[PDB]
Design a protein around this ligand. Sequence first.
Ligand SMILES: *[C@@H]1O[C@H](CO)[C@@H](O[C@@H]2O[C@H](CO)[C@@H](O)[C@H](O)[C@H]2NC(C)=O)[C@H](O)[C@H]1NC(C)=O
Ligand SMILES: *[C@@H]1O[C@H](CO)[C@@H](O[C@@H]2O[C@H](CO)[C@@H](O)[C@H](O)[C@H]2NC(C)=O)[C@H](O)[C@H]1NC(C)=O
Ligand SMILES: *[C@@H]1O[C@H](CO)[C@@H](O[C@@H]2O[C@H](CO)[C@@H](O)[C@H](O)[C@H]2NC(C)=O)[C@H](O)[C@H]1NC(C)=O
Ligand SMILES: *[C@@H]1O[C@H](CO)[C@@H](O[C@@H]2O[C@H](CO)[C@@H](O)[C@H](O)[C@H]2NC(C)=O)[C@H](O)[C@H]1NC(C)=O
Ligand SMILES: N[C@@H](Cc1ccccc1)C(=O)O
Ligand SMILES: N[C@@H](Cc1ccccc1)C(=O)O
Ligand SMILES: N[C@@H](Cc1ccccc1)C(=O)O
Ligand SMILES: N[C@@H](Cc1ccccc1)C(=O)O
Ligand SMILES: [Ca+2]
Ligand SMILES: [Ca+2]
Ligand SMILES: [Mg+2]
Ligand SMILES: [Mg+2]
Ligand SMILES: [Zn+2]
Ligand SMILES: [Zn+2]
Ligand SMILES: [Zn+2]
Ligand SMILES: [Zn+2]
Lengths: 481, 481
Amino acid sequence: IIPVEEENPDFWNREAAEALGAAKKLQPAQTAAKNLIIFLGDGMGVSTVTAARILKGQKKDKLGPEIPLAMDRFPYVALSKTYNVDKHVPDSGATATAYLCGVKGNFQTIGLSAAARFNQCNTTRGNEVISVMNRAKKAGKSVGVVTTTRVQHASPAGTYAHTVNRNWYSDADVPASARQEGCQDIATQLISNMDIDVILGGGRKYMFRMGTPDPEYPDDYSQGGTRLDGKNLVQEWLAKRQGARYVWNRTELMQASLDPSVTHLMGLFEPGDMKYEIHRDSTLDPSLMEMTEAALRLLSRNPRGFFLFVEGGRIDHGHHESRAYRALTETIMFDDAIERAGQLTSEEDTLSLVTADHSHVFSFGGYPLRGSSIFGLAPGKARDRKAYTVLLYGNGPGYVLKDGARPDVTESESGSPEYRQQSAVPLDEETHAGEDVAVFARGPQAHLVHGVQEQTFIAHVMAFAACLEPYTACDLAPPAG
Amino acid sequence: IIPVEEENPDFWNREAAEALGAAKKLQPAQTAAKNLIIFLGDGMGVSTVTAARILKGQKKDKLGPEIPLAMDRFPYVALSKTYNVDKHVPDSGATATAYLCGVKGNFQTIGLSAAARFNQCNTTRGNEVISVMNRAKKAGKSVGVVTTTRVQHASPAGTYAHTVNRNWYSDADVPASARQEGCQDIATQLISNMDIDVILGGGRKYMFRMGTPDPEYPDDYSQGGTRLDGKNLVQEWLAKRQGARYVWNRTELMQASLDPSVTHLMGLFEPGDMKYEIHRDSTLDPSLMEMTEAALRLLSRNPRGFFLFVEGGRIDHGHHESRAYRALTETIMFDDAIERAGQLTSEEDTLSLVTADHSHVFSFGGYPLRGSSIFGLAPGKARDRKAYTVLLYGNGPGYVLKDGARPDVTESESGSPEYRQQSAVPLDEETHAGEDVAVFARGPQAHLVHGVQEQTFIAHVMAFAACLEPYTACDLAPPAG
Ligand SMILES: *[C@@H]1O[C@H](CO)[C@@H](O[C@@H]2O[C@H](CO)[C@@H](O)[C@H](O)[C@H]2NC(C)=O)[C@H](O)[C@H]1NC(C)=O
Ligand SMILES: *[C@@H]1O[C@H](CO)[C@@H](O[C@@H]2O[C@H](CO)[C@@H](O)[C@H](O)[C@H]2NC(C)=O)[C@H](O)[C@H]1NC(C)=O
Ligand SMILES: *[C@@H]1O[C@H](CO)[C@@H](O[C@@H]2O[C@H](CO)[C@@H](O)[C@H](O)[C@H]2NC(C)=O)[C@H](O)[C@H]1NC(C)=O
Ligand SMILES: *[C@@H]1O[C@H](CO)[C@@H](O[C@@H]2O[C@H](CO)[C@@H](O)[C@H](O)[C@H]2NC(C)=O)[C@H](O)[C@H]1NC(C)=O
Ligand SMILES: N[C@@H](Cc1ccccc1)C(=O)O
Ligand SMILES: N[C@@H](Cc1ccccc1)C(=O)O
Ligand SMILES: N[C@@H](Cc1ccccc1)C(=O)O
Ligand SMILES: N[C@@H](Cc1ccccc1)C(=O)O
Ligand SMILES: [Ca+2]
Ligand SMILES: [Ca+2]
Ligand SMILES: [Mg+2]
Ligand SMILES: [Mg+2]
Ligand SMILES: [Zn+2]
Ligand SMILES: [Zn+2]
Ligand SMILES: [Zn+2]
Ligand SMILES: [Zn+2]
């Protein structure tokens, strides 16, 4: 459909005049960032952003593409080059090293320079690269890690961990030789490497000894503790800190976040990754936005400021399943968390960056009409006389042949939360994609986020803005009130 | 392969430190743009840019992704929302209206507000929106249109034409009713709507009466004149202007561009679109870079400045064929033209924008090793036990079933200039994609290109920078020397 107001050139001329006015008003800060937030949309490439924008727009009863996401309102944009040192199409671990530690690494390692080698424990030491979050903590800031994945998953692990193998969630995953060589599982590193004030996400199971029933699924043994060393890492973490609280459900999280005596909060809401938002039990589990707010309640108390990592972690997972419905709904929730954080913080003293670790082979094509559902069929039949969807994947588990032929698809099928968009090539999991991703920035020194940059720039501009190592001689004035 | 220098964190820290230094040195101009250049990569979405960067890097014997394209060096980047008023996934005509005239339009129309309707001549009048190029000419600037497509193709036509049907190249294409209603074919509009100092690209055939042999293919009747009105539009254009020259080959173009007495130059190098660079006859046909230089030689003479449109027009065509080899080699040539223009102009007085009209359902995935060919196979077999390529398309003519199965592919096959990457859905032509495209900007007022903008912003920032209508009260100082 053609919106009538848009048929008039004045509509476009006014909008552009306003955009020019806003552009002209942008001025760089001469002051440091008190607070740092990185919002990481895992797998949230440019095609994901646009498709999510359209979906979000339509959920708000608009046509879609004209409605800004919260991230779209950020004044500064750059393109970020995501290649890992060893692979053009990266993984989450080595990209986390880039955007969290400011150094590129090798595929499937975390918090290590590219001198380290995947799954070779004996290449670890000397190659640890320290995250901006770690540097923020050393400088006296409170720090928080919030994600819809396991808190031991590759992205959040980038803020605290150093490992040659992102798969080493608990000691059960670490080969005996690596255990003897002292390569700690990620769950251990979570509680041991550094003090983290707020830890929120999934990954209960890695914290408890094998045979420990999960509190939420005591009748599903597969959800229980994984640990072989008999340690209760939650208990160990709590014992180290007065005012520390552990929560496994939403209501306790709420309670803890409002409690002045709670100085450290660990909230682990599922045994593994958290449920997709569309599957979330809102009585038991906090949304990403809620976890973000909980974190900010505690982190904001520190007069020295905070560093916060917030991950839309299952955007990535939706794309891997080639279920764009899941990828895009996760993206919207992620954008909602960005919006919520912007309400709770000031751009006068908070540098906020939104980015992705990398993209996916997700495309938005055909020639759909304005206002049509992002999950709909492209107008017109394909050359095999069957329908096709506007959303497609280059590869992944949506590839199907029924009776030797590409299956037809209906609008009813294509719109289902379980629908897998078709691909060119069958794979159990759709792949990441290697094209540049966006960086959106606002707050002190956000104007430094510009042009086309290496992904490592994300970490460096954040360290610079808050005058953290290696930029303690940042030459910035104190954060604005 | 892992480049040794990149294994050291210092490599990344130094690079980022330098990037921060460069970012900090950026300062907005207080002065106007004397010259305006828009480089339009037709179909050149973010995945195209990255894949082209890698290819270009490797052509220069580097690993690929670490080597900047000329466009990558532009300091200011924004995301541009490409939706047409009536379609989420746009065409070249209505996007041209946006980035050339600053108003969004309906799919397959050119230079018209969205009050007009595709293929309805009687909805034209009153809906004409004037291009920045036209406004530049009114302000006394010289103006140039350079493209590897027909100069009457949708993108270049955006600079001068107003039509409800981009397919109306010559009067032969215009239905009798539209001809009677005075809807001029694009070739006519090219010579009649406005004075254009330099016109370079394809589209000879639309200028000459049916039965006129093409000068380059006199023995191929299909390449001859198309016109039904008996007009020689080249002769008409020449007759209107003293110092006007028409050329149909490279050597005459060279000659004309160096000739002080040549004030107007029309160079039409093929009957229709120009050959892909990989097929170009370098004795008969100028590359895009050469056409760009020729144009700049003439345009730069005017003390009031110039507006120049330069299009990498067949990037788009390569993707439609699902021949990434063609899309990417066109992209490199386009980037070479950008580089060449930057050598011949000063960013002190020239605002240059590089953008795309829209993207394609082109993806770069699998998990290829650093330094591997962009046209190679993804490591590892697909679920059907056959190989697949790192480059894929969501849809398009690369979809194949041999003996009811997806064909296997070899590196030799996949690397061929004729190879069509596989897709999920067979279509005669692969489709455009609707995700945001990049805008790169440098020169006076380039800092205004930021954040996420409507595609119309491109036209408006250019008009603003050169103090053209509607921004004659730009309040900028005269262009810097
Ligand atoms: C990391 O450990 C591996 C042990 O697997 C070492 O690899 C061995 O190196 C020796 C000498 O080069 C070879 O003869 C063995 O065959 C290798 N073992 C295996 C099973 O791969 C490697 O040297 C160690 N790296 C470091 C940095 O100490
Ligand atoms: C959220 O977690 C809290 C803390 O574990 C749960 O509270 C416990 O619930 C059991 C069963 O009702 C009681 O016997 C304990 O006394 C409670 N402990 C505390 C500290 O209150 C609470 O039930 C959980 N919420 C849900 C919906 O399961
Ligand atoms: C453009 O021309 C078309 C002629 O095709 C006009 O459409 C006609 O309008 C009348 C009255 O609405 C209908 O009864 C006819 O059936 C239409 N003709 C056809 C064949 O479509 C249209 O009105 C014109 N638009 C403008 C702006 O004048
Ligand atoms: C490029 O175009 C020029 C101009 O049309 C061609 O020059 C003509 O060539 C014919 C055949 O040799 C001569 O008889 C004419 O005298 C030439 N005209 C002029 C004005 O020089 C030239 O041949 C073309 N180049 C190529 C390679 O075809
Ligand atoms: N990122 C995906 C799968 C993956 C495999 C290999 C490398 C990178 C990613 C996941 O963990 O859900
Ligand atoms: N923003 C959250 C607040 C919250 C914080 C902590 C736990 C739960 C909820 C909400 O909408 O509910
Ligand atoms: N842009 C393509 C095909 C196309 C068809 C319909 C709409 C837009 C584009 C071309 O002209 O080569
Ligand atoms: N840059 C062009 C110069 C040129 C201008 C005009 C015509 C032909 C060539 C070249 O490399 O040849
Ligand atoms: Ca739960
Ligand atoms: Ca030729
Ligand atoms: Mg992640
Ligand atoms: Mg074009
Ligand atoms: Zn990821
Ligand atoms: Zn992933
Ligand atoms: Zn196009
Ligand atoms: Zn096209």
